[PDB]
From Swiss-Prot, chain B:
The modification Phosphoserine is found at residue 7. Present with 247000 molecules/cell in log phase SD medium. There are 2 genes for eL24 in yeast. This is Large ribosomal subunit protein eL24A. Belongs to the eukaryotic ribosomal protein eL24 family. Component of the ribosome, a large ribonucleoprotein complex responsible for the synthesis of proteins in the cell. The small ribosomal subunit (SSU) binds messenger RNAs (mRNAs) and translates the encoded message by selecting cognate aminoacyl-transfer RNA (tRNA) molecules. The large subunit (LSU) contains the ribosomal catalytic site termed the peptidyl transferase center (PTC), which catalyzes the formation of peptide bonds, thereby polymerizing the amino acids delivered by tRNAs into a polypeptide chain. Component of the large ribosomal subunit (LSU). Mature yeast ribosomes consist of a small (40S) and a large (60S) subunit. The 40S small subunit contains 1 molecule of ribosomal RNA (18S rRNA) and 33 different proteins (encoded by 57 genes). The large 60S subunit contains 3 rRNA molecules (25S, 5.8S and 5S rRNA) and 46 different proteins (encoded by 81 genes). It is found in: Cytoplasm. The gene is RPL24A. It comes from Saccharomyces cerevisiae (strain ATCC 204508 / S288c) (Baker's yeast).
From Swiss-Prot, chain D:
Component of the ribosome, a large ribonucleoprotein complex responsible for the synthesis of proteins in the cell. The small ribosomal subunit (SSU) binds messenger RNAs (mRNAs) and translates the encoded message by selecting cognate aminoacyl-transfer RNA (tRNA) molecules. The large subunit (LSU) contains the ribosomal catalytic site termed the peptidyl transferase center (PTC), which catalyzes the formation of peptide bonds, thereby polymerizing the amino acids delivered by tRNAs into a polypeptide chain. The gene is RPL23A. Component of the large ribosomal subunit (LSU). Mature yeast ribosomes consist of a small (40S) and a large (60S) subunit. The 40S small subunit contains 1 molecule of ribosomal RNA (18S rRNA) and 33 different proteins (encoded by 57 genes). The large 60S subunit contains 3 rRNA molecules (25S, 5.8S and 5S rRNA) and 46 different proteins (encoded by 81 genes). Pfam families: Ribosomal_L14. This is Large ribosomal subunit protein uL14A. Its main location: cytoplasm.
From Swiss-Prot, chain E:
Gene3D superfamilies: 3.10.440.10. The lineage of its organism: Eukaryota, Fungi, Dikarya, Ascomycota, Saccharomycotina. Belongs to the eukaryotic ribosomal protein eL31 family. One of its GO terms (molecular function) is structural constituent of ribosome. Component of the large ribosomal subunit (LSU). Mature yeast ribosomes consist of a small (40S) and a large (60S) subunit. The 40S small subunit contains 1 molecule of ribosomal RNA (18S rRNA) and 33 different proteins (encoded by 57 genes). The large 60S subunit contains 3 rRNA molecules (25S, 5.8S and 5S rRNA) and 46 different proteins (encoded by 81 genes). One of its GO terms (biological process) is regulation of translational fidelity. SUPFAM superfamilies: Ribosomal protein L31e. InterPro entries: Ribosomal_eL31 (IPR000054), Ribosomal_eL31_CS (IPR020052), Ribosomal_eL31_dom_sf (IPR023621). The keyword Ribosomal protein applies. This is Large ribosomal subunit protein eL31A. There are 2 genes for eL31 in yeast. The keyword Ligase does not apply. It is found in: Cytoplasm.
From Swiss-Prot, chain F:
It comes from Saccharomyces cerevisiae (strain ATCC 204508 / S288c) (Baker's yeast). It is found in: Cytoplasm. Present with 450 molecules/cell in log phase SD medium. This is Large ribosomal subunit protein uL3. Disruption phenotype: A mutant confers resistance to trichodermin, a trichotecene toxin produced by plant-pathogenic fungi. Component of the ribosome, a large ribonucleoprotein complex responsible for the synthesis of proteins in the cell. The small ribosomal subunit (SSU) binds messenger RNAs (mRNAs) and translates the encoded message by selecting cognate aminoacyl-transfer RNA (tRNA) molecules. The large subunit (LSU) contains the ribosomal catalytic site termed the peptidyl transferase center (PTC), which catalyzes the formation of peptide bonds, thereby polymerizing the amino acids delivered by tRNAs into a polypeptide chain. Belongs to the universal ribosomal protein uL3 family.
Amino acid sequence: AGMTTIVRDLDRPGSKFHKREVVEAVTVVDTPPVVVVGVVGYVETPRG
Amino acid sequence: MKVEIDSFSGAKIYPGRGTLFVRGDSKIFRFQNSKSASLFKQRKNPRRIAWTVLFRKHHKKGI
Amino acid sequence: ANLRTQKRLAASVVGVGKRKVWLDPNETSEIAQANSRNAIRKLVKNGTIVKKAVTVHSKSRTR
Amino acid sequence: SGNGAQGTKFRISLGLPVGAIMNCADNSGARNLYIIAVKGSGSRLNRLPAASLGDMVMATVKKGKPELRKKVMPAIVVRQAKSWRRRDGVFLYFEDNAGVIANPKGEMKGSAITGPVGKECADLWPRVASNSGVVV
Amino acid sequence: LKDVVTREYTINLHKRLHGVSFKKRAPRAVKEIKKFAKLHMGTDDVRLAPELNQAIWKRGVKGVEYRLRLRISRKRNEEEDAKNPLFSYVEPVLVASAKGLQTVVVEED
Amino acid sequence: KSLYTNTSRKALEEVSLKWIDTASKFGKGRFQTPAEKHAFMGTLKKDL
RNA sequence: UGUACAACGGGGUAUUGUAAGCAGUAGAGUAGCCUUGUUGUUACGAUCUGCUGAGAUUAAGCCUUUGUUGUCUGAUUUGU
RNA sequence: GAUAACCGCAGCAGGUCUCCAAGGUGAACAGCCUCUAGUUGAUAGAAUAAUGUAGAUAAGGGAAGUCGGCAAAAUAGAUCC
RNA sequence: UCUUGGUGGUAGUAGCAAAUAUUCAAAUGAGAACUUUGAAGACUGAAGUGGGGAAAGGUUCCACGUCAACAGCAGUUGGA
Ligand SMILES: [Mg+2]
Ligand SMILES: [Mg+2]
Ligand SMILES: [Mg+2]
Ligand SMILES: [Mg+2]
Ligand SMILES: [Mg+2]
Ligand SMILES: [Mg+2]
Ligand SMILES: [Mg+2]
Ligand SMILES: [Mg+2]
Ligand SMILES: [Mg+2]
Ligand SMILES: [Mg+2]
Ligand SMILES: [Mg+2]
Ligand SMILES: [Mg+2]
Ligand SMILES: [Mg+2]
Ligand SMILES: [Mg+2]
Ligand SMILES: [Mg+2]
Ligand SMILES: [Mg+2]
Ligand SMILES: [Mg+2]
Ligand SMILES: [Mg+2]
Ligand SMILES: [Mg+2]
Ligand SMILES: [Mg+2]
Ligand SMILES: [Mg+2]
Ligand SMILES: [Mg+2]
Ligand SMILES: [Mg+2]
Ligand SMILES: [Mg+2]
Ligand SMILES: [Mg+2]
Ligand SMILES: [Mg+2]
Ligand SMILES: [Mg+2]
Ligand SMILES: [Mg+2]
Ligand SMILES: [Mg+2]
Ligand SMILES: [Mg+2]
Ligand SMILES: [Mg+2]
Ligand SMILES: [Mg+2]
Ligand SMILES: [Mg+2]
Ligand SMILES: [Mg+2]
Ligand SMILES: [Mg+2]
Ligand SMILES: [Mg+2]
Ligand SMILES: [Mg+2]
Ligand SMILES: [Mg+2]
Ligand SMILES: [Mg+2]
Ligand SMILES: [Mg+2]
Ligand SMILES: [Mg+2]
Ligand SMILES: [Mg+2]
Ligand SMILES: [Mg+2]
Ligand SMILES: [Mg+2]
Ligand SMILES: [Mg+2]
Ligand SMILES: [Mg+2]
Ligand SMILES: [Mg+2]
Ligand SMILES: [Mg+2]
C-alpha cells in the first residue's frame, strides 16, 4: 500500500535512547485473506 | 509525542515533520515544512503573511 | 487554383504589401480570370479584393 | 572517536570535510579552525574525511593568537549547521559551524563556550558539557 | 446505434497536455481533440471547425486552455464517403466558463 | 517466516506503537484526521 | 450488458496565499465647487479594508464516486 | 545581389562593396517587444531508455579537484561616500 | 596500394537534429505535412528575413502549358 511513520518507545537496555521515543518508517502491506484452492505433492528424487 | 508549534505559522508539528533551527543567539525555531523554513530565511514577518495564525489573530479572523 | 500572381498584382495595384491584400475565398474562380491590372482594379471596385486595414500599434500606454 | 570520549555516538550526518573553516567557540584566543583531519575515519579512495557534531578533528588556527597559529591541535565540533537527524525523528541544524580546541584526551583548552552546543557533543565530551552553557 | 447525434462535451486538455513540449501544446491539442472525438463518436474521420482552431490557438502555441466545451456532431459523409461512411465535426461552444458542465445531448429541434 | 531462529535482541523486542502517522502523503500533510483539520481551521466557505 | 469500463461532473486530499466584481466615514495628497461641512462635494490617486484561508489548480503514474453521457463480436493463426 | 540567381564540385550555417532606416524601454544604431514591408523556408510523425550536444539547478563544505580555479559561479547600470 | 569499366557486402544501415513554429478549413488535383486562398498563431524588429544598387551571373525576369529527371521527404509547386 505504501509507507507511514510511527512513534514508539525503545526497549534497548544499554542504548542511550532506552525508554525514549523514536520515529520509525513502516511499510504497510494490505493483506486480505487468501483462498485455498489446491494441494500439490512433492517427492524427493535423486534429481531433486 | 509532544506536538509542537510552527514558529512562523502556528501549525502543529507532529513527530518527524519539518525542521528545527537553533539560531546563533540560542533561540529555537520549529517549522512544520520548508515553506515556513524558507519564509523564515527570507525574513518575512508572520504578521503580514495572510494564512498564518499570527496574521489571523491580529486581523481577527475565525473567532 | 494558383492566385499568387493575382495577390502580387493586387498588392501592386492597391499600393500595399501582399500581407495586406485580402482575396475572396468564395470568389476564387473569377479572381483567377484576372490576369491584368485592369481586371485587378475591377475586382477592387467590386470588393472581391479588399485593402485589409492596418494592424494597430497604439501609443496610449506610451502617452 | 579515538580515545577520551565517554560513550558511543549515533551516526550524525557529516557536514565538515577537510578544508572546512569553522568558528572557534571557546575563549582560547583563536577565531577559526581549519580542519585537516577527522579522528576514527575510514579509508576510502577519493573521499574527503568529513567531521560531524561531537567529532574530534585535527585543526590549525588560521585567525587568532600568534601563539596558537601555525600548529596542529585537536578540536571538537560543537555546532554543525548541516541538518542532521535524531532518532526521535527531529531534523535540526545550527546557523554556524563551530568547535572548541581540546587536547588529545578531550580536556578543553578554553573554559567557556560562546553559543549553543549540540547535545550529542555534550554527552560525548564531559568537559565540553562542563564548560558549555546552553545545550541545544 | 442511431447514427446522427450532436452532443456537447468538456475536454480536459490540461491532463492531456501535461508535460508536453511548449512548441507543441496547441498542435497536440488539435490531435487530442481528434482522439477524443474518435473515442466518443466512433469515427476515424474528424473535421474541426476553424473557429475551434482559433479557440485552441487563442493564447499562442503554449497557452491552450485547461478545458474546452466542444460540440461534436456525428454526420453523414457525402460525395464519395471513405472507409467509414460517417464523419464527426467539432464546433466550439461559447460559454462563460468551461467548468462544471456535463455531457449533454443537443437535440435537433 | 524467518528461515532461522533469530535471538539478536533487535528481534525478541516486544513493540508497542504509541502513534501512527495518518496525515496526507499527497502533500506535506498537516492534519491527522478531518476532525483535527476542522478543529484547527474552524469553518470555511464550502456549502453545508 | 457488468456489483463492467470510459469521458465529464461532484466530493476528499493537496499546492498557492485571499480572485474578479462591488462597496467603503481607509488613502500621502493635489486640483475644482460653494446655499462652507467638521467623519461636506467633484476629479485624479500607489495602496488598504470587507465580502475572502478567498479564488485558481488538482492525475496527467493521487483517492473516492449509487450523478450525466457513452462504449461493448474488427482481423489473423493454431491439433496429439 | 545571396541561409537558392555571385565564388566556394551543390539550391553549401562559409565568403563577397554600399545607400535608406518607425515607435517604446534605455546613455545607446545594445538587448528585449511592436508598426510598415517580408517570411513562416529548413524531411516528417509517434514515444520520452542509456550515452551524448545545448541549457540549467543543487543541502553542508568551499579548490580538499586538476599540470594549472580549466569550465562555471561570483561582480556588474546609475547616484552618493 | 596494376589500368579502364562494372558490381558487391557493410546496408534499407550511418544519417536527412544550427537558423523559436506551426495549425484548421476550403479549392485544385488520381494523389496535398509541403500548392493556392481564407483564418489563426508566430518570427525578421528599420546595422531587417524590408526597399535599391556595385562586382559577378546571364534570361534566372514574366506568362501559358507541364512533372520523366532535378528541388538528398513529397510536389498538383518551382530559379526545374
Ligand atoms: Mg492592365
Ligand atoms: Mg575503503
Ligand atoms: Mg605553517
Ligand atoms: Mg463532457
Ligand atoms: Mg516533463
Ligand atoms: Mg512562443
Ligand atoms: Mg451540463
Ligand atoms: Mg508524498
Ligand atoms: Mg482575505
Ligand atoms: Mg490570488
Ligand atoms: Mg480584488
Ligand atoms: Mg480545477
Ligand atoms: Mg483513483
Ligand atoms: Mg446513459
Ligand atoms: Mg544568375
Ligand atoms: Mg568545398
Ligand atoms: Mg551558405
Ligand atoms: Mg552554392
Ligand atoms: Mg534598442
Ligand atoms: Mg508588423
Ligand atoms: Mg529540418
Ligand atoms: Mg552546493
Ligand atoms: Mg548553500
Ligand atoms: Mg568560504
Ligand atoms: Mg584555499
Ligand atoms: Mg591541490
Ligand atoms: Mg590531488
Ligand atoms: Mg598553483
Ligand atoms: Mg584547459
Ligand atoms: Mg575561465
Ligand atoms: Mg557616480
Ligand atoms: Mg586491385
Ligand atoms: Mg578506374
Ligand atoms: Mg556496386
Ligand atoms: Mg528505404
Ligand atoms: Mg536511421
Ligand atoms: Mg547529425
Ligand atoms: Mg530547426
Ligand atoms: Mg484540402
Ligand atoms: Mg507533418
Ligand atoms: Mg490557429
Ligand atoms: Mg519578436
Ligand atoms: Mg518566376
Ligand atoms: Mg502541372
Ligand atoms: Mg525529393
Ligand atoms: Mg517525386
Ligand atoms: Mg510543393
Ligand atoms: Mg514552375
